[PDB]
Amino acid sequence: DISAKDLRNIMYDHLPGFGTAFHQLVQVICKLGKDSNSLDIIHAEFQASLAEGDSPQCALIQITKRVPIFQDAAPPVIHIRSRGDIPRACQKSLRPVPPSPKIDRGWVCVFQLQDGKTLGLAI
Amino acid sequence: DISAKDLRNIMYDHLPGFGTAFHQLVQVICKLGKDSNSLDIIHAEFQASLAEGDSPQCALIQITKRVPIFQDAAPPVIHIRSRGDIPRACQKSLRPVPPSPKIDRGWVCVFQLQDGKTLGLAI
Amino acid sequence: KDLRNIMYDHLPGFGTAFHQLVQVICKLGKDLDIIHAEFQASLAEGDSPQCALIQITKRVPIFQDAAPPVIHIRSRGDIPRACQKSLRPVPPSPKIDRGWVCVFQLQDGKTLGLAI
Amino acid sequence: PDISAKDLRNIMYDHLPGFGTAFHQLVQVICKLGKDSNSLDIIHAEFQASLAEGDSPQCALIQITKRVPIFQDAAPPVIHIRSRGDIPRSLRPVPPSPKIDRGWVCVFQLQDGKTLGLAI
Amino acid sequence: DISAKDLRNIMYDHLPGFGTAFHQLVQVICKLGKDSNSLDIIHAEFQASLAEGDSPQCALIQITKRVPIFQDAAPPVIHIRSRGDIPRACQKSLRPVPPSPKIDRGWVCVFQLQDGKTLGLAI
Amino acid sequence: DISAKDLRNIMYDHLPGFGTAFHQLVQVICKLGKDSNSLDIIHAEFQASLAEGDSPQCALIQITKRVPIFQDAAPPVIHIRSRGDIPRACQKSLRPVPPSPKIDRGWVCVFQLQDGKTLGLAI
Numbered sequence: 001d002i003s004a005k006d007l008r009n010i011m012y013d014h015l016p017g018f019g020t021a022f023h024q025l026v027q028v029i030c031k032l033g034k035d036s037n038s039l040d041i042i043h044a045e046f047q048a049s050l051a052e053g054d055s056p057q058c059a060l061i062q063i064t065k066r067v068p069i070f071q072d073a074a075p076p077v078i079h080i081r082s083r084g085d086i087p088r089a090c091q092k093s094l095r096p097v098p099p100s101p102k103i104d105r106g107w108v109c110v111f112q113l114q115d116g117k118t119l120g121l122a123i
Numbered sequence: 124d125i126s127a128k129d130l131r132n133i134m135y136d137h138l139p140g141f142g143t144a145f146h147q148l149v150q151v152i153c154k155l156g157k158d159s160n161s162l163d164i165i166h167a168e169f170q171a172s173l174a175e176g177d178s179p180q181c182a183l184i185q186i187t188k189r190v191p192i193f194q195d196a197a198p199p200v201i202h203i204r205s206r207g208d209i210p211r212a213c214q215k216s217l218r219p220v221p222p223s224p225k226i227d228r229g230w231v232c233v234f235q236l237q238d239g240k241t242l243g244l245a246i
Numbered sequence: 247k248d249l250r251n252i253m254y255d256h257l258p259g260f261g262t263a264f265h266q267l268v269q270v271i272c273k274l275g276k277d278l279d280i281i282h283a284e285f286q287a288s289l290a291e292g293d294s295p296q297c298a299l300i301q302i303t304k305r306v307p308i309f310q311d312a313a314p315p316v317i318h319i320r321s322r323g324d325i326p327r328a329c330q331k332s333l334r335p336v337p338p339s340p341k342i343d344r345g346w347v348c349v350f351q352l353q354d355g356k357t358l359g360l361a362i
Numbered sequence: 363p364d365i366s367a368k369d370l371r372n373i374m375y376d377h378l379p380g381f382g383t384a385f386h387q388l389v390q391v392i393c394k395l396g397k398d399s400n401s402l403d404i405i406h407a408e409f410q411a412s413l414a415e416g417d418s419p420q421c422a423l424i425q426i427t428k429r430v431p432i433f434q435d436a437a438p439p440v441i442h443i444r445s446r447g448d449i450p451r452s453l454r455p456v457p458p459s460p461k462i463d464r465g466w467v468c469v470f471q472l473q474d475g476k477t478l479g480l481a482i
Numbered sequence: 483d484i485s486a487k488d489l490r491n492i493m494y495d496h497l498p499g500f501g502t503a504f505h506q507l508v509q510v511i512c513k514l515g516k517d518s519n520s521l522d523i524i525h526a527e528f529q530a531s532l533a534e535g536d537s538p539q540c541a542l543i544q545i546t547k548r549v550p551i552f553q554d555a556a557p558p559v560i561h562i563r564s565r566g567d568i569p570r571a572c573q574k575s576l577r578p579v580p581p582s583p584k585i586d587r588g589w590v591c592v593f594q595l596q597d598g599k600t601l602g603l604a605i
Numbered sequence: 606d607i608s609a610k611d612l613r614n615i616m617y618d619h620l621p622g623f624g625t626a627f628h629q630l631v632q633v634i635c636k637l638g639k640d641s642n643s644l645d646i647i648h649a650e651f652q653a654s655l656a657e658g659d660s661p662q663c664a665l666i667q668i669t670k671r672v673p674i675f676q677d678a679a680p681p682v683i684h685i686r687s688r689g690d691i692p693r694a695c696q697k698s699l700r701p702v703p704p705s706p707k708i709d710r711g712w713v714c715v716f717q718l719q720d721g722k723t724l725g726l727a728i
């Protein structure tokens with residue numbers, strides 16, 4: 001029974017950079033994993049993908065496609081004031097939101113500004 | 124019908140253009156498509172993925188997993204003298220490569236340095 | 247697949263480099279009967295079965311960029327005995343068409359490439 | 363650089379681990395025909411460059427037989443022996459007109475007229 | 483008859499969302515459109531300008547030039563405690579207020595510190 | 606008589622920040638004014654606008670609307686390597702390039718990347 005905090009840190013060890021789209025995906029994966037009691041499943045699958053020679057980025061994408069809750073839960077909406085509140089690297093990946101985005105279709109989260117505007121964070 | 128230059132251009136126009144691993148993946152996908160006469164099916168799948176709600180980044184990953192040519196396909200090797208010869212948006216995306224790297228395992232290309240060393244560009 | 251069985255009969259010996267190459271070609275064939283057509287024609291041209299297998303890795307567009315599969319095992323003892331005389335350190339990014347059958351990766355982390 | 367046949371064999375032997383294989387004997391065949399056509403330098407260049415390209419020594423040897431002009435229609439050497447039990451250390455029926463570049467290292471010619479071909 | 487709240491949201495959705503002077507102008511235009519009963523005129527004019535190929539920013543400036551009330555109306559005075567209360571993307575766009583400022587003359591609003599200093603927000 | 610260099614700096618002191626859309630507009634206005642022999646009419650109108658209580662930003666936009674060369678003027682294309690070569694402040698207002706773009710309709714310039722992607726700099 002690994003904690004979401006510890007799994008996050010293990011995944012972060014493999015992903016250089018700060019405030020990236022893939023760091024945001026780790027957060028989404030760990031929260032949703034925690035809330036669906038599937039952190040251990042996710043961790044085992046992450047370790048197994050690295051052992052087959054997958055990049056950590058590929059391993060995480062494979063988790064969003066295989067682990068049940070990621071086709072049960074939509075990309076989380078994150079409420080922020082203005083666009084500058086989005087991490088710098090994440091901003092490089094912002095797109096208009098499709099009607100109803102899926103996590104396994106390359107959408108990490110949706111940022112919603114105070115003015116109501118929504119922005120889809122692509123992987 | 125479609126040429127590699129015309130498919131690259133279509134892909135580039137769907138991407139922001141900062142110079143990420145996905146940008147490098149456009150060249151990689153279209154070269155394999157050209158060399159193996161697969162550019163039409165790649166184009167068809169790329170457009171169908173977008174119409175399905177995929178982000179272009181995800182759509183490019185789907186190609187590497189669905190188009191039969193990318194099965195066991197090795198990332199191309201780019202020969203360089205030094206590490207600083209790599210674009211900065213790819214710089215924080217470089218890892219040691221597994222024994223026999225596969226594109227569908229999340230590997231865009233391999234940079235091979237003068238001193239014999241190799242760095243892998245993860246998606 | 248019975249394509250592998252057709253190839254096996256033309257290659258005397260067990261657990262050899264070319265025996266492993268039949269296994270590698272056939273699996274990557276699924277993941278082809280154009281392989282079977284080229285093989286039997288090469289034999290009729292007077293090729294040794296070994297050469298016929300190499301021609302498949304060279305002509306067929308799949309193998310142009312196809313990388314050898316990775317076989318995860320415990321140690322050097324798990325490698326077939328006749329393969330052990332063909333083992334070499336791996337190149338940066340190996341390809342089948344460049345004379346590499348597979349990569350054995352041990353528990354230790356050490357990798358050994360099987361040459362044709 | 364004018365590399366000798368005796369020298370080029372040993373250069374190639376270093377890259378081939380073990381001893382008494384078909385690829386080991388292919389080195390001899392390549393260096394014999396290379397010496398007779400003064401092409402040992404273009405063989406050395408292609409063998410050393412092929413390895414630097416990411417090829418195994420075995421793949422590099424096969425490529426020489428397919429690309430170097432002297433190996434065109436070139437027959438494998440005929441080794442005259444008495445019986446099968448004289449062959450050291452695979453051995454298939456022989457096609458009508460065996461060529462090195464079609465994967466035949468040498469031919470064993472038996473005292474009773476039978477021929478066996480050593481495949482690569 | 484479109485509301486002030488709905489017209490704002492439409493305009494916001496056509497803008498990036500950083501909180502520049504053009505963001506502030508949305509609230510100013512819609513408040514005064516409400517007062518002049520021209521919210522429908524402004525909405526139709528904004529959409530017509532976008533179809534002509536105007537950037538949304540230029541579309542907003544055109545409203546201040548074309549809708550009569552912006553010839554007479556004062557840049558609204560926003561009372562705040564200190565310069566920190568002015569949004570970050572507006573901090574640079576602050577200028578000394580000219581005598582009797584006009585919106586059609588490129589002034590969005592006036593910030594008034596309880597210190598006494600007035601600061602004009604240029605477009 | 607006024608030069609292109611002198612008019613740039615007269616306009617620069619009125620505008621805030623570095624690498625901004627309006628700073629780029631100054632360069633765009635002065636280059637086209639020089640090439641079309643209209644620096645003196647642009648300089649005269651800019652100064653008259655300021656004297657009438659216009660913000661410098663508004664005075665610049667007015668030039669693009671009132672000086673005859675801008676009536677049919679399409680924005681200049683600036684060729685760069687990748688999106689990261691665009692000034693940070695200019696990046697905040699990049700948009701798809703509309704068909705037949707015009708400066709007087711709110712487009713400072715067009716950025717064309719090496720990969721053929723074009724980004725329109727809105728004011």
Ligand SMILES: [Cl-]
Nearest residue numbers: 012013014015
């Ligand atoms: Cl690590």
Ligand SMILES: [Cl-]
Nearest residue numbers: 002040043044
């Ligand atoms: Cl676990």
Ligand SMILES: [Cl-]
Nearest residue numbers: 071102104105
């Ligand atoms: Cl779905």
Ligand SMILES: [Cl-]
Nearest residue numbers: 125126127157
């Ligand atoms: Cl083409």
Ligand SMILES: [Cl-]
Nearest residue numbers: 172175177185
């Ligand atoms: Cl798909």
Ligand SMILES: [Cl-]
Nearest residue numbers: 022215216246
């Ligand atoms: Cl990354």
Ligand SMILES: [Cl-]
Nearest residue numbers: 301304305428
């Ligand atoms: Cl060939």
Ligand SMILES: [Cl-]
Nearest residue numbers: 412415417425
């Ligand atoms: Cl080659």
Ligand SMILES: [Cl-]
Nearest residue numbers: 404429430431
């Ligand atoms: Cl040659």
Ligand SMILES: [Cl-]
Nearest residue numbers: 553554584587
């Ligand atoms: Cl007035």
Ligand SMILES: [Cl-]
Nearest residue numbers: 580581582583
């Ligand atoms: Cl006054």
Ligand SMILES: [Cl-]
Nearest residue numbers: 676677707710
């Ligand atoms: Cl027009």
Ligand code: NA
Nearest residue numbers: 139143145180
């Ligand atoms: Na991207």
Ligand code: NA
Nearest residue numbers: 126127128129
């Ligand atoms: Na082309």
Ligand code: NA
Nearest residue numbers: 291292459460
């Ligand atoms: Na023959």
Ligand code: NA
Nearest residue numbers: 494497499505
């Ligand atoms: Na806004």
